[PDB]
């Protein structure tokens, strides 16, 4: 409807796949080459389904900060025959607050879903499903089951992936450029 949705749509159309694990179906953001991200609570194993195709996981790393606190991001390298468009230049370098964000989801349950969530706070610490978690972004939208892995964007930036909610607020794990240096 506007330049926010334009950016979100551009990311969804080229940089997302449907990931299925034994814990559910997730929006999965491809970042570069065969590297993607998913919430750690997806419990990625040796095999994952990508757009309903059996795919070997070449590597999976559940990220933690240097205090050994959960970040709720898992970086996955996929045994896929095709690379993602490189979107690492759209990743923020530092922790920050944002205006006018969009949360975009693409699953069997929620195809082509875009939500204008508005103001995004650098919330920091969250007890997420009983797990202490850092670098949490917060938006005042009542997000629901099926939205985990959803991409949070502003015009020009891919800033996080949706990892939970409490019925009134939604929470995303930050994406930082420094996670994806090679």
Active site residue 25: no
Active site residue 72: yes
125 Cβ contact partners less than 8 Å away, ≥ 6 residues apart: 132, 133, 134, 136
Measured between alpha carbons, how far is 157 from 142 in angstroms, rounded to an integer? 23
Candidates 106, 134, 148, 162; catalytic one: 148
Candidates 72, 106, 134, 162; catalytic one: 72
Do residues 122 and 40 touch, judged by C-beta distance below 8 A? no
Say whether 14 sits in a helix, a strand or coil.
helix
- Nearest partner of 132 among 172, 91, 72, 63, judged by Cα: 72
Measured between alpha carbons, how far is 141 from 138 in angstroms, rounded to an integer? 9
What are residue 37's phi and psi, to 5 degrees? -125, 155
Active site residue 61: no
Candidates 41, 106, 134, 162; catalytic one: 41
Measured between alpha carbons, how far is 34 from 3 in angstroms, rounded to an integer? 28
Say whether 176 sits in a helix, a strand or coil.
coil
Burial of 174 (0-12, 13-18, 19+ CB in 10 A): buried
The residues carrying an active-site annotation are 41, 72, 148
């Amino acid at each position: 409807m506007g330049p926010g949705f334009d950016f979100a749509q551009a990311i969804m159309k080229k940089n997302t796949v449907i990931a299925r694990t034994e814990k559910g179906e997730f929006t999965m953001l491809g970042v570069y080459d065969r590297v993607a991200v998913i919430p750690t609570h997806a419990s990625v194993g040796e095999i994952i389904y990508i757009n309903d195709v059996e795919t070997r996981v070449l590597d999976a790393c559940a990220l933690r900060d240097l205090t050994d606190t959960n970040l709720e991001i898992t970086i996955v390298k996929l045994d896929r025959n095709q690379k993602f468009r490189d979107i690492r230049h759209f990743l923020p370098r530092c922790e920050d607050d944002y205006n006018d964000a969009v949360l975009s989801v693409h699953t069997s349950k929620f195809p082509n879903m875009y939500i204008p969530v508005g103001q995004v706070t650098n919330y920091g610490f969250l007890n997420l499903g009983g797990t202490p978690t850092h670098r949490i972004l917060m938006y005042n939208f009542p997000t629901r089951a099926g939205q985990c892995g959803g991409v949070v964007t502003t015009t020009g930036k891919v800033i996080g992936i949706h990892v939970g909610g409490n019925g009134a607020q939604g929470f995303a794990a930050m994406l930082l450029h420094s996670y994806f240096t090679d």
